[PDB]
């Protein structure tokens, strides 16, 4: 099957920047699958962070020149990996962040119009307090 | 863009019952481009329903939804005690995506 | 070329339809299945225009007025900016309603000619 | 103000799996030589998967049902299950294949049911098997497991490029990526009815007569974390080896039944040395240089190369056809880390083989009478991590086979099979 | 020894067999119904 796995809670002072891993097992390569980054802030809904696709990254309006999202595929020794990275930290970032992968194999999927996409897969989510 | 709205924000209901959730989307989705999620508390939110009313495997039979532009539901008939917790709403129409505020079913 | 265009926009694509739709002693059982099995798909294809009035057209016009739920973008974003693909995968969802009531104009329409000429 | 209008010939596919007409120049495929037209298409990206690829499958049944066909109308060899009594050979008339030959007289039927003929043949030991322990009484190896038919004089194993070229309504698409891995997408995409010859050879380690890589060195594998997948490594610059036998075979016949002709070795005239192939330290030397090196951008250990493991003498030695002869040939020499000149591998020959692990049950090739020698070009290699799952500081590479599809997979890696649905509904102002 | 019961319908036979090799037979028994 596929689990995503994340790193553990964190936990910052203002002014400071974060970087956040995902470890995918089951997903052969991201050539074939695409990232995205989500926010969840405590009592509220989710929100979009950022995205890799075809080795494409991109952010939200919100996050454009804050958030630096990287990855690498199946090296012999580790999973494809993604991190997402946040520059400067304030007091209204502190929520859970999740990592979601969908496969892009079909065209027809259904699970994804042109770049915006559906999310099959999740992980267990990270969460930062600052 | 396209702000969706899940009108019953707050929802009981008993084992073996069937319920209704409705999402209101700020313009019209002629593609389907709707997705139901589902999440228990402390625990990642699972998807359960893509493309309006299509589902994933392993979910099961009871789940269905329907589309209709603006105006898209969620069923679950024969409610059982998983069932619980706070449903989703995305749109993957418009970039970027956005979400429903949630409706919690108790 | 076959299958040319298949990343230009549907304006530019339509131009030369043709040319996709021209290309379009023991055997061995495994080749007289494939065929059959392509004889079979072409007379399918060639029922299902048929049946709409479009016998041997490429380009055919039809009574039915497009549904504004069926997909509401301008026509020039259609024309100008998208390809074949991503417009058939939008409108999955409504193919076989746009087929049934192609099929019932066409219907109605044989019918009110024969009753004109009665007239 | 908008009316619905139908279109025929619109450039719109979906991936399907079709069986494919096979050309070459129950089963066969015998059209004309093709003559491919590539036509590429702009501004489309494809994804692409090696690994789910149901050519490769087809490619594996029309291999097998060819092979089969042929070695369908000629001799089966079920009188040969007897009792051999074997002893050594007389080559002198110390050697270096005298310890490889047996000389084993038998008793074999006739024409007649009634009478029966003693006769003589060269058998090598790995043909052979003893019954009871210092004794000597022989048994072909195959006895125990199927009936052998004896490969018919009349087949020719020089393997023809194979062309696979899809039915009408639908096409071959191909990634044109000079660094394709095989997964993933690709940006220069070209659409044809059918592929360059593919030619069916058979060999276990080393991946023999085929294509070269445009640029650089490409890995592939399933699954590089999973040590149970093999490595593809697929070169651009391909290694020169040559495999000779010298030993000057004598063929000859023996009348097993009513117009059942059973072919053998008679007699080892000339030269007694055994069968081996050459090859050139330095471009090897080179080669491994390379790999090494490509390797390195994946694993970042130190990368060794050691011997295959297991005794089997097939999943350990390099298996591969010169002529109609099958050669076993020991590649420990060539893995293994002196190559300054020429590299000699021993090689060993085999009569009974059984190329797909008993779907083709087994076949008895003949003695090929002659000095035997066959020229080669490697283009690949097949590796297998040994998944030692510790604390080390060096991964260990060795050869290793595996199924027959992964020397398929290495050439129809950069070709789909998709189905064209040629129907469109468009709103225009037609009425 | 080691409504009713099968001692009547089941024969013990002994034959001899060919091997895989047809130079050597084998004495051979089965239990064989009567029918
Ligand atoms: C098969 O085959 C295939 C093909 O052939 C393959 O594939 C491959 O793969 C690979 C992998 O493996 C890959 O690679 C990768 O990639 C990726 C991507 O990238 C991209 O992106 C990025 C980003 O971008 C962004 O940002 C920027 C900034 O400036 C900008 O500019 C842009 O525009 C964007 O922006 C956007 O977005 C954002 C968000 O994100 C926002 O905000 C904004 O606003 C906007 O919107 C980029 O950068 C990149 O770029 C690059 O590249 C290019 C190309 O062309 C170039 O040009 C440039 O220049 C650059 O470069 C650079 O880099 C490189 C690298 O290599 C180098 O070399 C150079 O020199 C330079 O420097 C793109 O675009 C990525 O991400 C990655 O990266 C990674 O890795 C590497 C390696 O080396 C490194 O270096 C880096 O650093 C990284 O790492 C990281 O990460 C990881 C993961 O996670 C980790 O682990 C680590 O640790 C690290 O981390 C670190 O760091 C970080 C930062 O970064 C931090 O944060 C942390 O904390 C730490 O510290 C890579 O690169 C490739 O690409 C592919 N290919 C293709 C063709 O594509 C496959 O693989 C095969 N298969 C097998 C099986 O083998
Ligand atoms: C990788 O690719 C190479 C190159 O194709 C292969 O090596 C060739 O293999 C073929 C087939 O085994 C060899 O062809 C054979 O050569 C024999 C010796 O040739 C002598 O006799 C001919 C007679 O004209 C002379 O021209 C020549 O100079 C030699 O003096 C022939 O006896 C064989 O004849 C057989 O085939 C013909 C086909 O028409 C029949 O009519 C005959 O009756 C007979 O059955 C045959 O022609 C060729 O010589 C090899 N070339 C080299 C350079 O070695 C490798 O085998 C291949 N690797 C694989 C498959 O693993
Ligand atoms: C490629 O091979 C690797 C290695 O064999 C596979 O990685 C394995 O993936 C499975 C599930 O995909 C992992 O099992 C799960 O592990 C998580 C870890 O937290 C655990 O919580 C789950 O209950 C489950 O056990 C397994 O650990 C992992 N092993 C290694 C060594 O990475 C990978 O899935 C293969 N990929 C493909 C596409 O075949
Ligand atoms: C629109 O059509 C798509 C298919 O073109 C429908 O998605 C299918 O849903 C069924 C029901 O679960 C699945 O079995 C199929 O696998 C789905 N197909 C694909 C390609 O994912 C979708 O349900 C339709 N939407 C509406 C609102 O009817
Ligand atoms: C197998 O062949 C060997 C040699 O042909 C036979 O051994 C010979 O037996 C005769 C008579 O017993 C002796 O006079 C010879 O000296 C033996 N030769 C050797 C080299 O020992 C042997 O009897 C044969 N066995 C069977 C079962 O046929
Ligand atoms: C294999 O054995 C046969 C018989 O055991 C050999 O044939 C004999 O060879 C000797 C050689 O001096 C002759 O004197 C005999 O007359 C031969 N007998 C028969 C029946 O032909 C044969 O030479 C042996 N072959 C090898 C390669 O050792
Ligand atoms: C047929 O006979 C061969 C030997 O001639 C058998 O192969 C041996 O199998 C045993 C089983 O434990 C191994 O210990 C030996 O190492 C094997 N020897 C060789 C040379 O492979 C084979 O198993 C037999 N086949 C069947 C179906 O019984
Ligand atoms: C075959 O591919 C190898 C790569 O594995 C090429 O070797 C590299 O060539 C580039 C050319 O600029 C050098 O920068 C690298 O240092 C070379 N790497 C190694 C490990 O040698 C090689 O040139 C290719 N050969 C041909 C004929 O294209
Ligand atoms: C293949 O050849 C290698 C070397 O040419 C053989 O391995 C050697 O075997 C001798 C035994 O005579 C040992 O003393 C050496 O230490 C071995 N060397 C290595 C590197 O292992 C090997 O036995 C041969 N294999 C077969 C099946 O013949
Ligand atoms: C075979 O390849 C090895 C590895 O590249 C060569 O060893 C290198 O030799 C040079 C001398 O010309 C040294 O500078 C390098 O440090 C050596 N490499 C290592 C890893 O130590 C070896 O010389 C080559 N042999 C032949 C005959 O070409
Ligand atoms: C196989 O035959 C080829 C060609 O006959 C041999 O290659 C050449 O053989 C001639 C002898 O006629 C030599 O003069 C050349 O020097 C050889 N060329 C090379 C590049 O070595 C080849 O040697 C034979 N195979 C073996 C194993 O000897
Ligand atoms: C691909 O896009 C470019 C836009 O720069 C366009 O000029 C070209 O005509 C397109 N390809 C085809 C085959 O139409
Ligand atoms: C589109 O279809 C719906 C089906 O319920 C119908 O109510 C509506 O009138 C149709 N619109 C047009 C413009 O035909
Ligand atoms: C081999 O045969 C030769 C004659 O062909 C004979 O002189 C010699 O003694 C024989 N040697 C053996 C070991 O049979
Ligand atoms: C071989 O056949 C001959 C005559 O056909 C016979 O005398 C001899 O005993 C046979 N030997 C064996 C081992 O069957
Ligand atoms: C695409 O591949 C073809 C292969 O012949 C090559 O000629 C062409 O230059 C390539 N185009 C690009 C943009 O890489
Ligand atoms: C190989 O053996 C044959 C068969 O006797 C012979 O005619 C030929 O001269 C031999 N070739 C050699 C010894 O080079
Ligand atoms: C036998 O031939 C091989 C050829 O690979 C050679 O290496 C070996 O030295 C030879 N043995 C003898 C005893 O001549
Ligand atoms: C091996 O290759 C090198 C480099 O091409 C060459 O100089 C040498 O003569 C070759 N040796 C043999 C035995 O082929
Ligand atoms: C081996 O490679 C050389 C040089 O690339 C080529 O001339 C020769 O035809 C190749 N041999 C085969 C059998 O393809
Ligand atoms: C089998 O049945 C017969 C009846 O004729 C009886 O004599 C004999 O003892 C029985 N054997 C058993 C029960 O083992
Ligand atoms: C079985 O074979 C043996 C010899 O091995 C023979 O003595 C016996 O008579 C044979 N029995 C039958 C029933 O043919």
């Known amino acids: 099957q596929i689990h995503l796995v994340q790193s553990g809670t964190e936990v910052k002072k203002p002014g400071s920047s974060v970087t956040v891993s995902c470890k995918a097992y089951?997903?052969?390569?991201?050539?074939?699958?695409?990232v995205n980054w989500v926010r969840q802030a405590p009592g509220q809904s989710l929100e979009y962070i950022g995205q890799?696709?075809?080795?494409?990254?991109?952010?939200?309006?919100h996050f454009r020149g804050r958030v630096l999202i990287s990855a690498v595929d199946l090296t012999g020794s580790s999973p494809p990996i993604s991190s997402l990275e946040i520059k400067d930290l304030t007091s209204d970032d502190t929520a859970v962040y999740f990592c979601?992968?969908?496969?892009?194999?079909?065209?027809?999927?259904?699970?994804?119009?042109?770049?915006?996409?559906?999310?099959?897969?999740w992980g267990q989510g990270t969460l930062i307090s600052v | 863009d396209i702000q969706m709205t899940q009108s019953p924000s707050t929802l009981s209901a008993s084992i073996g019952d069937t319920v209704r959730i409705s999402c209101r989307a700020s313009?019209?989705?002629?593609?389907?481009?709707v997705a139901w999620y589902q999440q228990r508390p402390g625990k990642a939110p699972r998807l359960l329903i893509y493309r309006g009313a299509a589902l994933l495997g392993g979910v099961p039979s009871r789940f269905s939804g329907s589309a209709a532009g603006t105006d898209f539901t969620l069923t679950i008939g024969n409610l059982q005690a998983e069932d619980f917790g706070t449903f989703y709403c995305q749109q993957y129409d418009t970039y970027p995506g956005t979400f429903g505020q949630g409706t919690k079913v108790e | 070329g076959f299958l040319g265009a298949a990343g230009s926009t549907m304006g530019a694509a339509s131009i030369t339809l043709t040319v996709q739709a021209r290309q379009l002693t023991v055997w061995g059982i495994k080749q007289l299945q494939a065929r059959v099995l392509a004889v079979e798909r072409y007379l399918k294809d060639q029922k299902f225009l048929g049946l709409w009035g479009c016998s041997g057209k490429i380009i055919c016009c039809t009574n039915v007025p497009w549904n504004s739920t069926w997909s509401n973008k301008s026509y020039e974003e259609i024309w100008n900016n998208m390809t074949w693909i991503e417009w058939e995968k939008e409108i999955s969802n409504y193919t076989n309603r746009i087929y049934d009531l192609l099929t019932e104009s066409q219907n109605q329409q044989e019918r009110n000619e024969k009753d004109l000429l009665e007239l | 103000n908008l009316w619905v209008t139908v279109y025929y010939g619109v450039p719109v596919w979906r991936d399907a799996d079709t069986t494919l007409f096979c050309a070459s120049d129950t089963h066969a495929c015998v059209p004309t030589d093709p003559n491919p037209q590539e036509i590429p298409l702009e501004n489309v990206t494809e994804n692409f998967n090696m690994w789910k690829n149901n050519m490769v499958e087809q490619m594996q049944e029309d291999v097998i049902s060819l092979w089969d066909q042929s070695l369908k109308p000629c001799v089966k060899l079920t009188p040969l299950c007897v009792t051999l009594n074997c002893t050594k050979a007389n080559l002198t008339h110390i050697g270096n294949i005298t310890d490889e030959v047996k000389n084993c007289t038998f008793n074999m039927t006739t024409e007649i049911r009634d009478k029966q003929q003693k006769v003589h043949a060269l058998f090598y030991a790995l043909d052979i098997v003893q019954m009871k322990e210092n004794g000597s009484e022989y048994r072909l190896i195959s006895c125990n497991t199927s009936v052998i038919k004896q490969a018919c004089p009349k087949i020719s194993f020089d393997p023809i490029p194979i062309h696979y070229c899809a039915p009408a309504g639908y096409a071959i698409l191909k990634c044109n990526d000079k660094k394709f891995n095989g997964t993933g997408p690709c940006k220069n995409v070209s659409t044809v009815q059918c592929t360059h010859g593919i030619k069916p050879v058979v060999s276990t380690q080393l991946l023999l007569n085929g294509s070269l890589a445009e640029e650089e060195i490409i890995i592939r594998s399933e699954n590089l974390t999973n040590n149970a997948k093999n490595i593809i490594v697929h070169l651009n610059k391909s290694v020169s080896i040559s495999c000779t036998r010298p030993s000057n075979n004598t063929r000859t016949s023996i009348r097993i039944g009513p117009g059942q002709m059973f072919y053998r070795t008679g007699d080892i005239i000339g030269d007694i040395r055994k069968a081996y192939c050459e090859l050139n330290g330095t471009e090897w030397n080179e080669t491994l240089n390379k790999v090494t090196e490509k390797l390195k951008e994946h694993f970042n250990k130190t990368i060794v190369f050691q011997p295959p493991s297991g005794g089997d003498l097939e999943t350990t030695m390099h298996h591969f056809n010169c002529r109609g002869e099958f050669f076993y040939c020991n590649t420990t020499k060539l893995f293994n880390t002196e190559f300054n000149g020429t590299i000699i591998l021993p090689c060993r020959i085999k009569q009974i083989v059984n190329m797909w692990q008993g779907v083709g049950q087994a076949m008895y090739a003949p003695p090929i009478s002659g000095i035997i020698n066959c020229t080669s070009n490697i283009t690949g290699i097949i590796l297998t991590r040994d998944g030692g799952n510790g604390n080390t500081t060096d991964e260990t590479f060795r050869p290793g086979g595996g199924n027959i599809k992964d020397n398929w997979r290495s050439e129809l890696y950069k070709y789909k099979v998709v189905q064209i649905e040629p129907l469109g509904i468009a709103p225009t102002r037609c009425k | 020894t080691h409504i009713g019961n099968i001692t009547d319908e089941v024969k013990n036979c002994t034959f001899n067999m060919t091997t895989e090799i047809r130079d050597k037979q084998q004495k051979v028994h089965a239990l064989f119904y009567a029918l």
């Open positions: 089951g997903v052969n390569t991201f050539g074939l699958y695409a």
């Open positions: 979601t992968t969908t496969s892009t194999y079909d065209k027809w999927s259904g699970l994804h119009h042109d770049g915006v996409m559906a999310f099959s897969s």
């Open positions: 890799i696709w075809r080795w494409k990254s991109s952010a939200s309006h």
């Open positions: 313009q019209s989705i002629t593609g389907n481009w």
